[model samples]
Target chain A: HMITYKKLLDELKKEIGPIAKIFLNKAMESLGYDDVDDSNYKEILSVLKMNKELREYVEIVEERLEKEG
Target chain B: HMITYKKLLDELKKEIGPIAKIFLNKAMESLGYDDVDDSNYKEILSVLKMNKELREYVEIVEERLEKE
Candidate 1:
């Protein structure tokens, strides 16, 4: 079977116990926010393009977005 | 100084060893792909919304992207 949520958690805990908890917590906590919508994505890229440092990070996200278009 | 990329890798190795290597390799390989521009983030979230399980993984990434 593919990894179950529990299996993934167990593996992480085995490898890094408390750290795993923290990382998973962060991941789970992130779910509380609203989903990223298309307008937001476009807006983010617009801003990233304006900022030099983050410009590099924009490509793959942009690529994925374009694929959907 | 904030964590340098090398230091981040070292710390991950110390914490998770080969597992760290695989994770980092995947992360770096991911980087080699074009950056996840905004449209992709939106699209991924849209797909994740359709795919119930992965929907959960999208939040923090969405948050960070929103902030940036």
Candidate 2:
């Protein structure tokens, strides 16, 4: 089954939470994609998962988000 | 009626718009506040409205937000 970016995001959000959603928003912003449900989900997730620094950043942000929540 | 920060944000979103809303989010993030309907609305809006640099920064971020 094909995964839409929005669906992937919802799943990731439920799994990881709001920080993941915000991180994805920042990611989409950085990647210059106007739509939330952009087509480059595979690429975005691949790079995000593989990049240690970005993953760390996401974790930090998640911690912040969680703390605030 | 006392203005809820959430109400203010909704009004501002329709007034100054979404970029303004994002700016407020960033503001809330910086202030270490968890809730969207945080207080200090008057102060927040005052600073954001008065600070030219911050306004410019918000504009830049908004442009980025708008463009992609």
Candidate 3:
């Protein structure tokens, strides 16, 4: 049950690189995630979408999740 | 295509009521919606999600969008 978003955070980490830490940090701060999941992720992504740099990568994650989900 | 979210915005209007204009105004400023659609909606919701008053309402809209 918890493992799905281990894959998600890992994919997000690989996709977003060093800024991946920033994403994690922000998620922790805003949405308070130990792991990402459906409930909290949209708010996390909403926070990041404010940053023009981080926007494209999420939809990549989002698109991939759409297939898996 | 165009008509779907006329129903959406209209439903949103009914759902959110007097503050509905506030949503449209926020959408116009941030996401610039003549009409709401998939492409622009997440960001529009994103902007509104920041507001304490507006947060639950967008999710209401989002959930309805989920159905129809």
* Candidate achieving the largest TM-score: 3
Write model 2 residue lDDT over B21-46, tens digit each, in one string. 76666444433345533345443443
Model 1: residues with Cα > 4 Å off, grouped in runs: A1-69, B33-68
Mark the regions of model 2 whose C-alpha exceeds 4 Å error after superposition: A36-38, A51-69, B1-68
Tens digits of lDDT, candidate 1, A1-69: 332345434544554455544443333322322333433434433433333433444444455446656
- Candidate 3 local lDDT, B22-49, one digit each (tens): 5555444433245656666665555665
The lDDT of model 2 is 0.49
Name the better of 1 and 2 by lDDT.
2
For all candidates in order, state the fraction of native interface contacts they contain.
Answer: 0.00, 0.00, 0.00
TM-score of each: 0.25, 0.33, 0.43
Considering lDDT, where higher is better, how would the candidates rank from best to worst? 3, 2, 1
User: What value does the lDDT take at residue B43 in candidate 1?
Assistant: 38
Score residue A46 of candidate 1 by CA lDDT: 40
Give the alpha carbon lDDT tens digit for every residue of A2-34 in model 3: 334566667677777865765555444433246
DockQ of 2: 0.03
Candidate 3, CAPRI quality class derived from DockQ: incorrect
